[PDB]
């Protein structure tokens, strides 16, 4: 009728219905907490430019991933499995990459990426990228990761808040590049004031499991590890 209008009915797919069910129980149980930090990829983008001499294309999400494995390998306290009661500390680094498709967001799990090289990390993200787009992947390769990493910065949404996917205590949401300003170089110098592109990384964390200082060191030594890859190597 006139007030309420003609709609279209959409059936919620089982895939989406399970997703919504889980996200609901998580929103209820998990006191989600979010953090934000902005780091310098400029010299790292340069690193990318050289690596482009090689015949595998590598992206920045690969750096964010390897840096998450390096930070969690340094701080495993951030990487834990919450089941019911107790935190489950996993020395094993399982990375869940969020890829956008027409079917919705696929979460291919990278097994043991902590011990894998950069080249193999890129070729791996590409492999799971194919396997995820042709729909080959089985459920378990979408499952069991120790944490998740997602970048919406290859689209927009300068800042974003995500919903943690249980039983995982953290997810990384990455944004765009901002002309953030480092000062005049020389303390006595002319050198006028200079914006540089700085990538954004948003840390989602459960207040219960994750400790404020725990996440603070996670994104902190995360920005530090990114302030040079030699710290990532």
UniProtKB/Swiss-Prot annotation:
Q: Where N6-succinyllysine occurs along the chain?
A: 126
The subcellular location is:
Mitochondrion matrix
Say which domain of life the source belongs to. Eukaryota
* Subunit text: Part of the inner core of the multimeric pyruvate dehydrogenase complex that is composed of about 48 DLAT and 12 PDHX molecules. This core binds multiple copies of pyruvate dehydrogenase (subunits PDH1A and PDHB, E1), dihydrolipoamide acetyltransferase (DLAT, E2) and lipoamide dehydrogenase (DLD, E3). Interacts with SIRT4. Interacts with DLD.
The job of this chain, per UniProt, is described as: Required for anchoring dihydrolipoamide dehydrogenase (E3) to the dihydrolipoamide transacetylase (E2) core of the pyruvate dehydrogenase complexes of eukaryotes. This specific binding is essential for a functional PDH complex.
Q: Which disease is it linked to?
A: Pyruvate dehydrogenase E3-binding protein deficiency: A metabolic disorder characterized by decreased activity of the pyruvate dehydrogenase complex without observable reduction in the activities of enzymes E1, E2, or E3. Clinical features include hypotonia and psychomotor retardation.
Q: Which family is this sequence assigned to?
A: Belongs to the 2-oxoacid dehydrogenase family.
Please state what the protein is called.
Answer: Pyruvate dehydrogenase protein X component, mitochondrial
Full-sequence portion shown in this chain: 269 to 501 of 501
């Amino acid at each position: 009728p006139n007030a309420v209008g003609t709609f279209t009915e959409i059936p919620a797919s089982n895939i989406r219905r399970v997703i919504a069910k889980r996200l609901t129980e998580s929103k209820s149980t998990v006191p989600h907490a979010y953090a934000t930090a902005d780091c310098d990829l400029g010299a790292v983008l340069k690193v990318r430019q050289d690596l482009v001499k090689d015949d595998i294309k590598v992206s920045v999400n690969d750096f964010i991933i390897k840096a998450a494995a390096v930070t969690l390998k340094q701080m495993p306290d951030v990487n834990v499995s919450w089941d019911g009661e107790g935190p489950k500390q996993l020395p094993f680094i399982d990375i869940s990459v969020a890829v956008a498709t027409d079917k919705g967001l696929l979460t291919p799990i990278i097994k043991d990426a902590a011990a894998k090289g950069i080249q193999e990390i890129a070729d791996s993200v590409k492999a799971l990228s194919k396997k995820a787009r042709d729909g080959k992947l089985l459920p378990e390769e979408y499952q069991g990761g120790s944490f998740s990493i997602s970048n919406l910065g290859m689209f927009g949404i300068d800042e974003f808040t995500a919903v943690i996917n249980p039983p995982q205590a953290c997810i990384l949401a990455v944004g765009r590049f901002r002309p953030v300003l480092k000062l005049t170089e020389d303390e006595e110098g002319n050198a006028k004031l200079q914006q540089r592109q700085l990538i954004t990384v948003t840390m989602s964390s459960d207040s219960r499991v994750v400790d404020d200082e725990l996440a603070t060191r996670f994104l902190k030594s995360f920005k530090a590890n990114l302030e040079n890859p030699i710290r990532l190597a």
